[PDB]
Amino acid sequence: MASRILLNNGAKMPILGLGTWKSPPGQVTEAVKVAIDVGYRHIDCAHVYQNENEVGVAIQEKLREQVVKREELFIVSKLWCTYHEKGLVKGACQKTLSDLKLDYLDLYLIHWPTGFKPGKEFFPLDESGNVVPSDTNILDTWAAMEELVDEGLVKAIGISNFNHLQVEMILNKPGLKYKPAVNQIECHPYLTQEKLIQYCQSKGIVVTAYSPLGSPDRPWAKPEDPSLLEDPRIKAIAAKHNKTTAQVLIRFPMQRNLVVIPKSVTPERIAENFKVFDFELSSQDMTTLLSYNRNWRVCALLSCTSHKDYPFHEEF
Ligand SMILES: NC(=O)c1ccc[n+]([C@@H]2O[C@H](COP(=O)([O-])OP(=O)(O)OC[C@H]3O[C@@H](n4cnc5c(N)ncnc54)[C@H](OP(=O)(O)O)[C@@H]3O)[C@@H](O)[C@H]2O)c1
Ligand SMILES: O=C(O)CCc1ccc(-c2cccc([N+](=O)[O-])c2)s1
């Protein structure tokens, strides 16, 4: 297992990164510092997480301390829905750069295919709780992303939560200048994504798997939900390999040629989650884990299900 994967922009991306959604701002600086100390070279960020300043403090300290060189880091962020208007994209990117204390991002993603009305609120609502859409075509948002590459603000651009038809729409964009480098999507044994993954990979788009542990700290968890970390079938595979269940859940996407971004603010878990380059799952293990698919999603919002670009009506 090599540590990086080659992107279609010619750059190499570390296959293991640290997630930061829900990482408390008064814990995430230490989390990122520890992560870098124990080997992480890829951090997954977003403006909507409201903690980029604090992530940036950690990155900057480790750069200043000469623990790692900037060229060795791979920092990812995402354009939030309320900034899909072409005239807002640069400012959104620059705010993220300022907070992260960087002069470029390695990868900048359209966070969701759904554009929302611009304003202070991240989810602008009408009086019934439907999100208020923007009419900016995603192809136009893509053109604005391409400009960021041409201005030196980002080395690569990509997409997140795009379904197969939406990926195809970008790939078929009239006058397309840069293909997406990455599609970042939810992926784990309960949402295995075979069709979408094969399609993206076939087009040279690298897939990043989010919520690989099933996001046990997600705000809307319910007792009746399935639980990857507690599934005795997965625990059994872990026990056989003398690894933790989390380690199996992280190794799984790695062996599908995916990038994976487990989140933790717990130092011992941050280290545990990185110790996944010293064992292999068999083909039988892989097929067994794939068999647990049930199309179960951590991330899908009722408020967006009527948006014309809602991604999860389509089979994939
Ligand atoms: N593009 C998108 O729309 C999108 C959507 C969702 C997520 N993401 C990205 O993907 C990242 C990962 O997804 P996620 O945050 O939803 O959930 P996740 O990585 O699947 O799971 C995070 C949860 O697992 C716990 N955990 C971590 N390591 C563990 C271990 N070794 N043993 C037991 N528990 C462990 C964490 O607890 P502690 O932190 O307390 O240690 C936390 O409660 C996000 O942080 C974000 O960067 C992107
Ligand atoms: O922000 C993160 O990375 C994780 C937190 C989220 C969970 C669901 C989100 C969402 C945003 C826009 C649209 C839709 N939609 O169409 O279903 C969903 S964001």
Side-chain angles (χ1 to χ4, degrees), residues 1-68 70 72-85 87-116 118-119 121-126 128-136 138-194 196-221 223-234 236-267 269-301 303-313 316:
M1 183 74 58
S3 65
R4 305 206 180 208
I5 188 168
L6 181 61
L7 301 180
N8 63 10
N9 74 335
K12 294 179 183 179
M13 180 173 187
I15 68 176
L16 194 41
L18 180 73
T20 64
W21 175 40
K22 312 171 264 59
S23 297
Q27 287 182 244
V28 74
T29 300
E30 182 63 11
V32 172
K33 288 178 180 179
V34 166
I36 291 170
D37 288 343
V38 306
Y40 290 73
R41 297 293 180 265
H42 165 190
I43 316 294
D44 183 76
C45 309
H47 177 68
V48 77
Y49 302 164
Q50 300 185 220
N51 59 6
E52 293 193 312
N53 190 39
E54 294 86 353
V55 170
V57 171
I59 295 169
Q60 179 63 20
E61 191 58 357
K62 294 293 166 186
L63 292 173
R64 188 194 69 86
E65 286 184 322
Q66 299 183 329
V67 176
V68 66
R70 175 65 185 95
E72 296 166 337
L73 290 178
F74 197 99
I75 310 302
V76 182
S77 187
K78 318 188 191 75
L79 178 78
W80 183 249
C81 304
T82 52
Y83 306 96
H84 282 207
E85 295 187 356
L88 299 183
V89 170
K90 189 178 190 185
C93 184
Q94 287 173 322
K95 168 62 171 163
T96 279
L97 286 170
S98 177
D99 286 345
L100 290 172
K101 298 158 278 278
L102 299 174
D103 61 8
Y104 67 93
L105 295 173
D106 297 274
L107 177 64
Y108 197 48
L109 305 176
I110 303 182
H111 203 150
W112 290 81
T114 52
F116 303 164
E121 300 293 346
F122 291 154
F123 281 85
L125 307 179
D126 64 30
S128 303
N130 304 303
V131 76
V132 179
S134 62
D135 62 13
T136 285
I138 203 66
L139 298 183
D140 293 323
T141 307
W142 188 254
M145 298 285 285
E146 293 174 326
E147 295 180 14
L148 302 176
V149 176
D150 291 328
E151 294 172 301
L153 273 69
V154 310
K155 300 296 188 196
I157 52 175
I159 58 189
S160 184
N161 304 294
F162 279 48
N163 70 35
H164 171 292
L165 294 179
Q166 294 169 325
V167 178
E168 190 168 53
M169 283 299 298
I170 300 287
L171 293 180
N172 292 340
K173 177 185 181 300
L176 181 67
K177 192 174 187 184
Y178 302 115
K179 293 178 207 168
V182 166
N183 189 14
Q184 178 181 129
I185 62 177
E186 189 176 335
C187 185
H188 46 69
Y190 300 155
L191 183 70
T192 51
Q193 300 273 25
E194 282 95 330
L196 183 54
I197 288 172
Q198 192 280 336
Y199 177 72
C200 290
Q201 295 184 152
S202 82
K203 300 296 183 179
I205 301 171
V206 165
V207 172
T208 301
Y210 77 65
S211 306
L213 310 181
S215 200
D217 62 339
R218 67 197 181 280
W220 45 83
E224 62 274 15
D225 294 348
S227 167
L228 288 165
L229 286 166
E230 294 299 329
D231 190 319
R233 302 169 297 179
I234 307 179
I237 292 167
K240 179 176 71 181
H241 289 280
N242 197 28
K243 301 298 284 191
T244 70
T245 305
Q247 289 170 324
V248 167
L249 291 167
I250 293 161
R251 182 72 191 195
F252 173 55
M254 295 166 69
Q255 290 187 210
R256 304 176 71 195
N257 300 307
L258 311 178
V259 175
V260 61
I261 53 171
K263 173 266 179 184
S264 182
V265 291
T266 304
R269 289 168 169 180
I270 293 168
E272 174 180 312
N273 291 353
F274 202 74
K275 293 174 184 180
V276 292
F277 295 88
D278 65 343
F279 81 109
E280 293 183 7
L281 296 168
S282 65
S283 180
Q284 182 176 13
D285 289 332
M286 294 294 294
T287 296
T288 300
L289 288 161
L290 287 166
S291 81
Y292 302 154
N293 184 55
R294 50 178 293 168
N295 305 319
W296 176 85
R297 294 180 188 276
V298 170
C299 292
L301 293 174
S303 65
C304 300
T305 52
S306 285
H307 192 293
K308 79 184 195 306
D309 301 312
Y310 180 74
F312 308 139
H313 295 319
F316 69 104

